[model samples]
Target: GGFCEVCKKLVGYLDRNLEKNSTKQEILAALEKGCSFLPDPYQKQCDQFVAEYEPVLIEILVEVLDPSFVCLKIGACP
Candidate 1:
């Protein structure tokens, strides 16, 4: 509910000039359905949110001197 509420709130923060007839109800509905079919402007913001904060569990590091040598480290924080 918190995440959904945040998304819904961000939708409200969007400027009216950015898009027309974008309603809170529509945004909530689109969210429930998934981002795939979300109308323009709204979809982009959602995409941006995911791109900025997507979780990463692990990371890979490699040594140029030894291509065969690789390291895996767990990502910090959630």
Candidate 2:
């Protein structure tokens, strides 16, 4: 549940931002607007995950911003 954990965290983060009336650039703004307050290592990894995966993620979620769905799309749920 190591990376799977972060994957959900990232998904949750994205979903939150979108829920706050935001996702993507025109919709969510930045791709890697990750956290700076998490456990240090997780922060870096989280940023990387969002930065790299945000491209595909953005495209995928271009349609509610479902964390569960996105996580599945990323094959990180299992």
Candidate 3:
């Protein structure tokens, strides 16, 4: 609902750290630790957050990792 300064700074740190090292998967794991705050009703809002942050995420990922990892591709489904 509101933009949090702490969240802003945190996401910034995540972006920068992701750029400095190819550790998005690890960071994402840590992110899961705190994800309960995001309830199911906010899924759309979460999508909005991703939309807002994805460009930055990709920028950092591309800088430090492979651009291919940042794309959507078909994979084997079970």
Q: Put down candidate 3 lDDT per residue, 1-78, tens digits, no spaces.
A: 242332333344445444455466765553333223445555455445554555455445435433233321111011
Best by lDDT: 2
Say which candidate scores most in TM-score: 2
Error of 3 at 10 (Å): 10
- What TM-score does each of the candidates earn? 0.26, 0.65, 0.30
lDDT-based ranking, best first? 2, 3, 1
What C-alpha root-mean-square deviation, in Å, does candidate 2 show against the real structure? 2.9
Give the total clashing residue pairs for model 1.
0
The alpha-carbon lDDT assigned to residue 5 of candidate 3 equals 30
The collision pairs in model 1 are: none
Compute the lDDT for candidate 3: 0.41
Evaluation by TM-score, superior candidate among 1 and 3: 3
State the local distance difference test value for candidate 1: 0.33
Query: Which residue ranges in model 3 land beyond 4 Å of their true spot?
Result: 1-22, 25-37, 57-78
Check candidate 3 and list the clashing pairs.
none
Clash number by candidate, in order: 0, 3, 0
lDDT agreement with native, every candidate: 0.33, 0.64, 0.41
